Amino acid sequence: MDVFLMIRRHKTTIFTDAKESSTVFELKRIVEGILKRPPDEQRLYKDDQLLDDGKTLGECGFTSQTARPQAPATVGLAFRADDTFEALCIEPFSSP
Template sequence: MKVEPENQQLMNERGTEVFDDEKQLSDYNLSAQTARAQSPATVALVFRQENGEFESLDITPLSSPPELPEVMKPQEPQAHELN
């Protein structure tokens, strides 16, 4: 993809918030802790059209996250661990 950065825009998955170029993804609560394989984050990328406007947001789901294996699911604390 050869599109100049000024002709690209990142935004949230609803298209209601355009991400500022000067900020990091973590400023938008996107990190390894909030975006996991079993609960992925979505970031939209749109391009500037020839008329100077950015294209409409259209997100096409490509896949569903896999079921988390039992060994990776959070464990309930045991009664003796609570004291």
């Protein structure tokens, strides 16, 4: 099936399409290929929850109905996470 991804940190968000059997390594490779820098220094957060990198997205809880293009769930990102995983600080959107 088809699972679509929000990646939100520090007034930057990243829209990225993937499949259900894709691991967290493959989306790490594609965000490395977008933003032109090391992807191993980043941490993902399912509302402040670290995922295992070898886990496929069927096991991660990101399905197609949960992460509909027109209504999708998010992860936050934290570069330089390394050991001191960057604390998540998502600046949200403005008031309507």
